């Protein structure tokens, strides 16, 4: 078991002896080891970068050199490892390349959901998007890099090969509301189409972290899908506050997070089901949630509820690794 910790991607290895996670000394590490670890995480042949950095994880024991426990690293640095170029965008209608991970998911020539690109082949969305009668992958088309719904027509999108819902998804409560779509062909990345980064353990997000949502969702409660892609600012809302008797009264589980503004009609309706809730940290854009439930957008004391992607990242890695 291997993972990347925190916003500086500190490579950590689990120690069965100590039953705890520990950073890798830069000592004798190289790109082949980094690629091996990336493969082990499910990123296949992707590899972005690896460099030594000062350990900002707090740890007190490290893995050196084949790896063994060491109280110190001779190079006094630990491995920072990025398996894919992600979390980059351009630099209230959205500009081309502003939200390049945003996709629109269609059935029967109709926008049904949103999603987020995480690899050339994999999209994060909501499990309730692909609830029957929409569980057949052949029903779906993904449109990437296109801002206007009217330019999302037959031939302009990408066929979907696989739909995988979280195995503990509960449609009754919308608990664990996350799913993966695998495309039949890999996307070509450019200025307009790029992935968002999956969140790492230890993001240490602030209680009311500033986030963004994007999508083609209706602005007006009684309305149709927006023709053009929109985006908006939202603040995270602490789950204990979201679970107030005047908000969602204990419907928010550990697999959910709340975002928006409690007070006033701020019209946070731009998001689509399954679409991204992202935040910028360490100059990287991270996928913190996927839009799940809460129809009363633009309403006081009814913020958006999102699948908590941080707790689903291990499942996502497992699925990506299992493919093939």
């Amino acid at each position: 078991c291997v993972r990347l910790y925190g916003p500086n991607f500190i490579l950590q290895v689990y120690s069965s002896q100590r039953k705890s996670w520990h950073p890798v000394c830069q000592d004798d590490w190289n790109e082949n080891y980094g690629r091996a670890a990336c493969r082990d995480m499910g990123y296949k042949n992707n590899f972005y970068s690896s460099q030594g950095i000062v350990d900002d994880s707090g740890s007190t024991s490290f893995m050196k050199l084949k790896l063994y426990h060491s109280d110190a690293c001779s190079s006094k640095a630990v491995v920072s490892l990025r398996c894919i170029a992600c979390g980059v965008n351009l630099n209230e209608s959205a500009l081309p390349g502003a939200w390049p991970w945003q996709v629109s998911l269609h059935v029967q020539n109709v926008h049904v959901c949103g999603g987020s690109i995480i690899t050339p082949e994999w999209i994060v969305t909501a499990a309730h998007c692909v609830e029957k009668p929409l569980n057949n992958p052949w029903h779906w088309t993904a449109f990437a890099g296109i801002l206007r719904q009217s330019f999302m027509f037959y031939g302009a999108g990408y066929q979907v090969e696989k739909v995988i819902s979280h195995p503990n998804y509960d449609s009754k409560t919308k608990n664990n509301d996350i799913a993966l779509m695998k495309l039949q062909k890999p996307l070509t990345f450019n200025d307009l189409v790029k992935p968002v980064c999956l969140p790492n353990p230890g993001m240490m997000l602030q209680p009311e972290q500033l986030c963004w949502i994007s999508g083609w969702g209706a602005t007006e409660e009684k309305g149709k899908t927006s023709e053009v892609l929109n985006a908006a600012k939202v603040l995270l809302i602490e789950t204990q506050r979201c679970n107030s008797r005047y908000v969602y009264d204990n419907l928010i589980t550990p697999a959910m997070i709340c975002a928006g503004f409690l007070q006033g009609n701020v019209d946070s309706c731009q998001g689509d089901a399954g679409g991204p809730l992202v935040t910028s940290k360490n100059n990287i854009w991270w996928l913190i949630g996927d839009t799940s439930w809460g129809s009363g957008c633009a309403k006081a004391y009814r913020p958006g509820v999102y699948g908590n992607v941080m707790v689903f990242t291990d499942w996502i890695y497992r699925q990506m690794r299992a493919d093939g």
Partner: nanobody
Framework: GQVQLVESGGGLVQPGGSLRLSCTSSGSPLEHYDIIWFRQAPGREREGVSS????????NYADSVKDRFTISRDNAKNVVYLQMNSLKPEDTAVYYC?????????????????????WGQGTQVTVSS
């Protein structure tokens, strides 16, 4: 709290008549839930007849009730309604509401979704002369 659905409005009516069933909730406001009205008569299988999303923007009807039944909701009043016109002896059954926390996808709620849902206690509807 966990939602508790309560149906009412049933009773005896003549063929051709109308009834308006309604469903409310305790424990948790009804506005959060997608709602399916389904029915069951003794000896027959359960039958979803109508469904509606939390926002009311997608409704769905069984062929057997289309044009005669109309589902609607009033979130401020915490209620979901089923208007049943031109009633028929074959519409006799206990009518139940089934609820799920409602999602945001732009699609109908399937009529067979009562298999994993909160359920009310049902309200008897009898159509006879």
């Amino acid at each position: 709290g966990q939602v508790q659905l309560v149906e009412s409005g049933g009773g005896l009516v003549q063929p051709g008549g109308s009834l308006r069933l309604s469903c409310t909730s305790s424990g948790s406001p009804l506005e959060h839930y997608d709602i399916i009205w389904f029915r069951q008569a003794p000896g027959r299988e359960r039958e979803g007849v109508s469904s509606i999303t939390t926002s009311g923007g997608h409704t769905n009807y069984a062929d057997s009730v289309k044009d005669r039944f109309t589902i609607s909701r009033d979130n401020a009043k915490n209620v979901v309604y089923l208007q049943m016109n031109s009633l028929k002896p074959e519409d006799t059954a206990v009518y139940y509401c089934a609820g799920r926390v409602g999602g945001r996808r732009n699609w109908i709620v399937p009529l067979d979704g009562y298999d994993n849902a909160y359920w009310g206690q049902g309200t008897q509807v009898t159509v006879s002369s």
